[PDB]
Amino acid sequence: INLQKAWGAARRVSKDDWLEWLRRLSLELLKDSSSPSLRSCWALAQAYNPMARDLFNAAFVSCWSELNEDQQDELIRSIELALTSQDIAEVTQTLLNLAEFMEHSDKGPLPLRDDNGIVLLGERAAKCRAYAKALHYKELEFQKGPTPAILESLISINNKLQQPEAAAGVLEYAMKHFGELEIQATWYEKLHEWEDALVAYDKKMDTNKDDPELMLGRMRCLEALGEWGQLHQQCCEKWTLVNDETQAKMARMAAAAAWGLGQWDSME
Amino acid sequence: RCFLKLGEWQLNLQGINESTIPKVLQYYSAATEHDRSWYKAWHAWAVMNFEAVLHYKHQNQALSKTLLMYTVPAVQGFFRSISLSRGNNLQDTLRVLTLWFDYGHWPDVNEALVEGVKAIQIDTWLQVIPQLIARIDTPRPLVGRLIHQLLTDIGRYHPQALIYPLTVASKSTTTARHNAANKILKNMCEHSNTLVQQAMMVSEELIRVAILWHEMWHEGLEEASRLYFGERNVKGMFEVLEPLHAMMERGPQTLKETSFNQAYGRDLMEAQEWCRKYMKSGNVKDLTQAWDLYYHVFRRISKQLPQLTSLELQYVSPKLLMCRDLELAVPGTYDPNQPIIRIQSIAPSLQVITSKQRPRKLTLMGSNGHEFVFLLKGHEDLRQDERVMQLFGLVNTLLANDPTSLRKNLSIQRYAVIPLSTNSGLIGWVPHCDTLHALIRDYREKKKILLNIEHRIMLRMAPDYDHLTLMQKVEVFEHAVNNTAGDDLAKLLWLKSPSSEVWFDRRTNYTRSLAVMSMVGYILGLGDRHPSNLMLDRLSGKILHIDFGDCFEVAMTREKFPEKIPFRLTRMLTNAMEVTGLDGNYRITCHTVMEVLREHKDSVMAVLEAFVYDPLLNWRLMDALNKKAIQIINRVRDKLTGRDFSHDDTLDVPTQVELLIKQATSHENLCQCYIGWCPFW
Amino acid sequence: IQWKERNSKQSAQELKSLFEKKSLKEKPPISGKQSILSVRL
Amino acid sequence: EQNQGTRREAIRVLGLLGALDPYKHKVNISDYSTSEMLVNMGNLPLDEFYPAVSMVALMRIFRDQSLSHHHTMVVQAITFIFKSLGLKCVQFLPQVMPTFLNVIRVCDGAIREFLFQQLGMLV
Amino acid sequence: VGSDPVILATAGYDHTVRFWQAHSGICTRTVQHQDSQVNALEVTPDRSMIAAAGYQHIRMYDLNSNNPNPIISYDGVNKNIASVGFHEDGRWMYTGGEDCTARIWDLRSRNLQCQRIFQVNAPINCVCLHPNQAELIVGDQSGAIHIWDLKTDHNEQLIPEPEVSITSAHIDPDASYMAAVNSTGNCYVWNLTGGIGDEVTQLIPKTKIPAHTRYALQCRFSPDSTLLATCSADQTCKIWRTSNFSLMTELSIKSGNPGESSRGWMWGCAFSGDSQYIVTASSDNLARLWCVETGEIKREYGGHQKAVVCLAFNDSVLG
């Protein structure tokens, strides 16, 4: 009942402010928790901080089981603001571990903004470099309704989880379950499918000449494939008649092509 | 190198005929003389000579001198190629074994054989110890003598590797096998006498705890009643139940046997007396009273079999619990590169698992303070499980020397299988595993979901489900799987995980361990994959298969309920491996395992040829006599080349894997399965 | 009625006209007024 | 380390050895119950869940000999748990008693005459 | 009773076969068929008895009297009987069994022995008599069509496409075409014997009409030979023309809701003597009466308690 002065204070700005906030939150959570065990362990938790850190989930669920509607609603609003306000790793790991502890119980997950915040927590799990949690939350988002953005993010998550075959299966599902050739060449770029991405970029450019980021991808494909000749030929034909934000992006590929063909005079 | 390439390319271009064989032979001999220290050239020369033997034998089956001219350098080159490997020479050893068994009686091949046995080392025979003992009772003198000499050398150098199958083969019913085994055993007591006596005592003592007297009499009467009242074969039931009277006539030796004698011995004596009165003067008037007494004994025995749930060693076998130290090694764990573990003690209480066969739960205690839990199996032949475990070890060794599968940690989980007789044995106990049926059962018992909900929906939509046609059963099955969300395994595996990283790693291991076992079971021909035969490791996520009783597509060619599926791939196994489907880790792992098994088809072909051609083990696949073995090995050869779906074309790995996926997960094939197989799970 | 085999397995010329009458008629089709159908409706 | 020259020398040695592939690195190279209890995998009810997780939290600091400063308050908290539960505190005995007796064996000073006393209350 | 120029009956899984008439949709007689389900039922051309065949027995039910019992039972086969039929003068039975056989039966209590057997390497799903009562089509689970003439004892086998089981086949009474469907919905139509003289039995593939993405379960012509209805597992019954083989009429029982998920398939259908009104059997525990022109249903019979998989509808020859 008396936890709103620790949760809804609305004065945290910096990193150590959030750390001392979670410190005071853990101590006021373990002090009065309606259980003799955590209340007795609070006196030692005042002197040792990792013990108050590991006893966070049990204290949280014991305090959550006793509050009513309005207090737990301000509680979930405060934990949403504490999630979306900062970017430090320790507090985000603490809140993610608390959320996965709560969703492992029989009472279900603690309700966030929309559908237990599986769109929020995964976006907090990708930046915290906990990719298994982000993959699980994106699978939970995929189980409701499949969209191309979820498939693209599944490819992006499964690539940095050292799983190329799972991302290849995601591409196979996207190609045999949609059937309109919505597959962008960046999807083949992430899978290192350089020939397929090259055929996709030539499929996209031969119909119409468009703005940049469409030939830079073809340059990246032909660079990673190992053809310096056509790369340098496509670079020299468009190096002059192009803007400023593209030469800074294509200059290293131009130098790589000039080195691969051995033309140092253009490489300089 | 280029001579070997010339021979390989000429074989790939023009096949095997009577015009290309001397050319590739002269190329291979040129390569072997050009190198003289290359395993590949000697191996290619030896397999080329063996293939020449096979072709010239198959040609005259639709002279014995050209076969000699091609078998003697085959044995020479194979014995040369054995010594070059030093780590893995199982295929070459099986090739010298089959040449030894088929043409080892000829006086010229015997020269190369007796040179080769003295040439190579003695550990290279430790991998072919069963396949030797399966041919110990051969009716030819010189090959049998050299087999006996090799077995005596193995027993002299490595006594622990040979004592268990020797004491298995000693207690047989055939004359030649038991006297040859007793001869080799009594020659083994010269340098090691305590080990042979302790091993005979241990084997003869825990063959008795496996099947007690009342279980033996129950099984024998249940067989003889079926035989007499279905086939009218009095001399069949006589040979069925007279060894029971023979083993009952030597006196009870334990308290349980004395109890069985005091309970049923007068009826089992008077029934034998009436059977003898019938056999002397033939009249059914003497047989009806004997069968009345036998049915009374059977009905009294059958009521006390569900009550059996524990065995104390003071009551069942008083010689096992007073050992307290032994010279025998713990069964299933002996390798010549590590110090041996001896049997120190045996626990004085066994727990009987309540089932139709009642397997005991034996737990020994080794010399290093570690408990070895086993499973004492009766009423079952464990000579097939040992051969499929050897095949699985070969497949693990094949996957171990490949770069793309070693980085993915692809392997099959094995357990020890130690047979003790024709109908009893000892299976190693794998810890931390749980049955696939006993996981969905607990998940549905916890989530308040009924167990047979899909079967109840099927019986409610149509009461005569098993009597419909194919299309009606397809409609009922599709209505059952559409009205039921099958996601028990995925949420069950996610609920029992501490975090998401361990859950993801376990799911990855589960997928890439299911795929390997699916492809290996397709190549082998595994059947009867109901959820009581698949186990999940709760600590690593891997998949363990058991009950290797239906191999080589026996379950596909049975009459009542034949299965039309290569492996088990249902909706519960598919919804728990990934979120998109089986096109991710599963298909790529299947491609990898299939191309590894196709690149090394000769080794698995040699192992399966040594398995199938055994005359004492090919009785389960035949329910001339050598025609079925040929047409089974031909089917296996079709599976490993992509000529299994159609013979006029050759499919590669992705097309074959896609056809197997479409065949295994089709509703028309799943709708025809038995209801105990649970095709909706 | 159960089933018994070994029936008419030797007479070819008798089986050529025993049950294969090859009755092919009713070539001319005529129109109608749909008496039962209109009576039902 | 923070000196830039030392980091430059370190990555120079790293390049001079040179780009070992990760599988060769992984070739060259209980505590499971606490992970199941801190997440409550066994799904014990919450009334008898706080004693188990508090006992694991007390045992995590009572196991180490480096932090021997708060040993009196973890011991009095353990006695508080064992008196407050009642007859159901028998399940925590195999995890509390060997560490308790090992601490009594390894420690020193006037806390030892304390610990034995508290041990008596456990008895 | 059946003292009426038109008769109608349905059968299914509710262990009864229902007889009714399309005047108000009320049942007249419920005949008790127990211990098995009915695969197919056919009325005798003399309009005296009906025959229900399913799972190793063929049971006759009398039409003039009121008897709920199987007066004459045929046994001897070891599995199901897919389809049965009679000679147009009531002389012999053609019965296709589930296991491997298509056989003949003699309807008189005498030793005529005009019964023969036809054995193939596949479980057969459909049999069809030729309209001149001389040939017979066998369709099995290997996609093979066995054109077997009863005059001789040699049979043609025709495979349009292997690896797919064909389900039905039928010939119009005018003897113009021969259509057949399989387990992927393809409907091939071969031109039948044009050799009225000496039964040469030439077949040329006229068309394949691609429709019915799900399983296609039964295809039937019309007695006027101007229409052809086929039923499929997407809960549809589509009637095509014989002129250019385009789509005449589409009928569906789909509610348009994602909450049903194929609540019942389209099992059987039949035409009338006018080829104007059809009766359809769906597995939504009821049968319907539709018209080939207006599309909307005209009648419904919902007296069954389970699904129904076969129906018989014969009327007088005039129409």
Ligand SMILES: Nc1ncnc2c1ncn2[C@@H]1O[C@H](COP(=O)(O)OP(=O)(O)OP(O)(O)=S)[C@@H](O)[C@H]1O
């Ligand atoms: N090798 C093993 N490792 C761990 N558990 C095993 C092993 N073998 C058997 N079990 C367990 O023992 C249970 C019962 O043993 P089984 O011998 O399978 O019983 P059963 O039903 O008589 O066997 P059959 O031949 O399938 S009828 C198995 O279902 C598993 O739970």
